[PDB]
């Protein structure tokens, strides 16, 4: 269905377009991550062949490689050219790569690597660098008591440090999701810079905010 | 009680005797004299009957 060669036996680095080398079809939203083995960081350098639809400020296609497996997690670069990529890193093992495609757009693709084991220097959570649990735990099922106190059960951080916990509700296959807030109370009501609860979509991209419940009340989605 | 009016010691338009009686009236409410003065005059002469 989606992207092709994905294999990760320490992974080598071969993340490629979903027909490469060919013309990739319209309307794909492939959602690449690579966040294991916490030493190595990042090196893209999509090897030598590169043509995606050159638009004026790129506007149709992108190859957004923002670091950290989401849409909010900070932007690094946008890629739409016909010239080989920018050979980069972002000090961490955290990544998210999209491959958007509107309707009438083709010509070549990419094929990636990572080829790395570096490490940074400064401490973040305690230690040499402490490659922090990117606050998270997945859960499937058909009923959740998804809680902000599993943080209080196991935070894997220090009390008094900023938290960024994201869940990933899967499914029971071929269905939808109905979220409803049983309990809801934030400390600083109506502040929305230092506290909120947000519900995106499938495929966590920043262009998918269903809701950004931040003030006093949260209703169902 | 339907409406809420209020009686009040008047004064000319702009006077120090507006404010320094307000200090004096508020003391008599909390001392209990202003209620005790009410039960001197508004107390009736023998109604009780125990209903």
């Amino acid at each position: 269905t989606q992207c092709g060669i994905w294999v990760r036996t320490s992974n080598g680095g071969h993340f490629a377009s979903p027909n490469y080398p060919d013309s990739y079809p319209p309307n794909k939203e492939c959602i690449y991550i690579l966040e294991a083995a916490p030493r190595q960081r990042i090196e893209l350098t999509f090897d030598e062949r590169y043509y995606i639809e050159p638009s004026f400020e790129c506007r149709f296609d992108h190859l957004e490689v923002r670091d950290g497996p989401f849409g909010f997690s900070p932007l690094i670069d946008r890629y739409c050219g016909m010239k080989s990529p920018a050979l980069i890193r972002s000090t961490g093992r955290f990544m998210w790569i999209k491959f958007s495609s509107d309707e009438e757009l083709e010509g070549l693709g990419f094929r990636a690597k990572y080829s790395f084991i570096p490490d940074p220097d400064f401490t973040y959570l305690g230690g040499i660098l402490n490659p922090i649990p990117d606050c998270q735990f997945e859960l499937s099922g058909a009923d959740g008591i998804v809680r902000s106190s599993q943080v209080e059960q196991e935070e894997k951080t220090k009390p008094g440090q900023a938290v960024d916990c994201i869940w990933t509700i899967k499914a029971t296959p071929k269905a939808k999701i109905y979220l409803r807030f049983l309990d809801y109370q934030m400390e600083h009501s109506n502040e929305c810079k230092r506290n909120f609860v947000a519900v995106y979509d499938g495929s966590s991209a920043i262009e998918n905010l269903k809701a950004k419940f931040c003030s006093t009340v949260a209703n169902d989605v | 009680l339907i409406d809420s009016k209020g009686y009040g010691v008047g004064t000319p338009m702009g006077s120090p005797y507006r404010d320094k009686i307000t200090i004096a009236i508020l003391q008599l409410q909390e001392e209990g004299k202003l209620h005790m003065m009410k039960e001197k005059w508004w107390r009736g002469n023998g109604c009780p009957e125990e209903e």
Binding site: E53, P54, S55, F56, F60, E104, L105 | -
Partner: protein, 51 residues
């Protein structure tokens, strides 16, 4: 302006299809007019709305 080098004016015609421009006054030689008129067909920009 058409791109000077290539015969691939599909980056141009994707904008005009999206920009709601149904009336075009092309200034080309007939060698290049045939090449745009094939690429205006593959873009689906040759309905009965255009001129």
């Amino acid at each position: 302006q058409l791109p000077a080098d290539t015969k691939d004016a599909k980056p141009l015609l994707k904008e005009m299809k999206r920009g709601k421009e149904f009336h075009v006054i092309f200034d080309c030689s007939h060698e290049m007019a045939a090449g745009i008129l094939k690429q205006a067909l593959a873009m689906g920009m040759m309905t009965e709305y255009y001129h």
